Each structure stands twice: as structure tokens, then as C-alpha cells.
Amino acid sequence: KVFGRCELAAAMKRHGLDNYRGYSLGNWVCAAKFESNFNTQATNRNTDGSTDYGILQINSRWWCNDGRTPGSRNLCNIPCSALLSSDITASVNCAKKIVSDGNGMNAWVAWRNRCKGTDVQAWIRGCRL
Ligand SMILES: [Cl-]
Ligand code: NA
């Protein structure tokens, strides 16, 4: 599923991401835009052989099991394919674990490079929340 901007913002807000660990909604929407272009089916392979999955590009090196990343962990306790669902619940619940791990949203490279320190409220502007 390819989300619209405001559609995703409302889904995220409903799933408890607004101000989660102090990150306003615009941060999460911005991250999703640059990580996946709002496509829940996005996958991207890393150099180390791990793979990023879904709207928030969650890495199989640490967070999910894809059966093909030897010596990895499964900290979110889910198959990585669950992160590609049109239902964002699993991605959001795993994101909450990631963002609480000490390093905040800096875990997401695109957020650090493209959202951090910008006017992220522009990402929810006009939306019916
Ligand atoms: Cl933080
Ligand atoms: Na694993």
C-alpha cells in the first residue's frame, strides 16, 4: 500500500506515534517519506547482507527475522514480512522499540539526514488529525 501523506499521519497518530518519546508526528511522517516514499512494500538490501523492510525500513540485522541474515537478532520478535503489510501496526510497534533504544530517531539514516533540524510540522500541515 502506498499511503497518502495525511492518511499516513492519521494512521500513525492513531497508533500512538504522536510525541512518542518526544518526537512530533511530522518527524515520523518525514522519516517514512524518505525511507520508503510511503510504500509499505519497500525493501532494500544493505551491503552486509541484511535487508530493510517496509514503510520505516526496519533492518533485519537487529529487528526482524527474514531467515537470510546469519548471526542477526530479532529484537522485535517478528518475521520481516510482517513489516510489509498494508496494516502498519507491526512496523509502528517495532519502531517504538527502536526509538526507545537510546539513540532516538537517529536510527533512521534518512531522518537524520533529511528531517532532523527541518520544519517537520510541514509534513502534517493541512491534515485532518
Ligand atoms: Cl531522543
Ligand atoms: Na533473526
Side-chain angles (χ1 to χ4, degrees):
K1 174 172 177 38
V2 174
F3 275 83
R5 175 174 65 85
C6 294
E7 178 182 26
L8 178 61
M12 288 178 153
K13 183 175 190 315
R14 191 176 71 90
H15 282 88
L17 282 182
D18 193 7
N19 301 332
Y20 190 86
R21 294 247 45 205
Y23 292 93
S24 65
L25 194 51
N27 282 283
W28 296 103
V29 174
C30 185
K33 169 73 179 171
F34 295 125
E35 288 292 347
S36 64
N37 203 15
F38 298 147
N39 179 7
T40 65
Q41 302 195 76
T43 57
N44 285 287
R45 185 124 207 208
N46 306 312
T47 58
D48 74 335
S50 53
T51 303
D52 300 344
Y53 293 86
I55 199 139
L56 282 167
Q57 287 294 276
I58 287 167
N59 191 344
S60 70
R61 173 63 54 201
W62 304 101
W63 302 110
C64 62
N65 178 227
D66 62 4
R68 64 162 205 196
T69 315
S72 55
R73 299 217 224 163
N74 182 5
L75 291 171
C76 291
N77 307 131
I78 41 155
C80 298
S81 65
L83 299 178
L84 304 178
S85 176
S86 59
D87 182 345
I88 65 168
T89 305
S91 284
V92 167
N93 288 350
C94 186
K96 289 177 178 173
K97 185 158 315 196
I98 296 165
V99 73
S100 307
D101 80 345
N103 299 302
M105 286 197 72
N106 292 298
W108 285 278
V109 54
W111 176 87
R112 180 164 14 95
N113 289 329
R114 302 179 80 173
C115 307
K116 191 180 183 173
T118 70
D119 178 32
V120 289
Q121 307 91 250
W123 286 102
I124 59 181
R125 217 166 275 169
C127 298
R128 205 181 277 139
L129 312 165

